[PDB]
């Protein structure tokens, strides 16, 4: 994106692996786990699955990470997984997600980007 962007929502099963919890800060979990990514209002939420997404049940109670000034790029390095993109927040939070294919992935980015630009609009 760049400017404008009405609102691009996206939610699906992704493998979120919290690597960095902050600038030059190594996360804790750092364990590959199936976390349902739920983008909305310009916020990326994490849930167990679509069953917890429709039930508004948070994976572990983690809130949605604001994509305000966040970066979203492909994971050009991961020599094992496919269709994976690295998401670097502004708070120094870096997460690793694995799409189902080049589509889901590319799309995400297109979405995550449509969210970043737009921003976490509130009222």
UniProtKB/Swiss-Prot annotation:
Highly expressed in brain, kidney, pancreas, and liver, and at lower levels in lung and placenta. Residues 8-117 form the PH domain. It is found in: Cytoplasm, Cytoskeleton; Cytoplasm, Cell cortex. It is linked to Spinocerebellar ataxia 5: Spinocerebellar ataxia is a clinically and genetically heterogeneous group of cerebellar disorders. Patients show progressive incoordination of gait and often poor coordination of hands, speech and eye movements, due to degeneration of the cerebellum with variable involvement of the brainstem and spinal cord. SCA5 is an autosomal dominant cerebellar ataxia (ADCA). It is a slowly progressive disorder with variable age at onset, ranging between 10 and 50 years. Spinocerebellar ataxia, autosomal recessive, 14: A form of spinocerebellar ataxia, a clinically and genetically heterogeneous group of cerebellar disorders. Patients show progressive incoordination of gait and often poor coordination of hands, speech and eye movements, due to degeneration of the cerebellum with variable involvement of the brainstem and spinal cord. SCAR14 is characterized by delayed psychomotor development, severe early onset gait ataxia, eye movement abnormalities, cerebellar atrophy on brain imaging, and intellectual disability. Probably plays an important role in neuronal membrane skeleton. Belongs to the spectrin family. This is Spectrin beta chain, non-erythrocytic 2. The chain holds residues 2219 to 2328 of 2390 of the full protein.
């Amino acid at each position: 994106g760049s400017s404008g962007s009405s609102g691009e929502q996206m939610e699906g099963m992704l493998c979120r692996k919290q690597e960095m919890e902050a600038f030059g800060k190594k996360a804790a979990n750092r364990s590959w786990q199936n976390v349902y990514c739920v983008l909305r209002r310009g916020s990326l939420g994490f849930y167990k699955d679509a069953k917890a997404a429709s039930a508004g049940v948070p994976y572990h109670g983690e809130v949605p990470v604001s994509l305000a000034r966040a970066q979203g790029s492909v994971a050009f390095d991961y020599r094992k997984r496919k269709h994976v993109f690295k998401l670097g927040l502004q708070d120094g939070k870096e997460y690793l997600f694995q799409a189902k294919d080049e589509a889901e992935m590319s799309s995400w980015l297109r979405v995550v980007n449509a969210a970043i630009a737009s921003g976490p609009s509130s009222g």
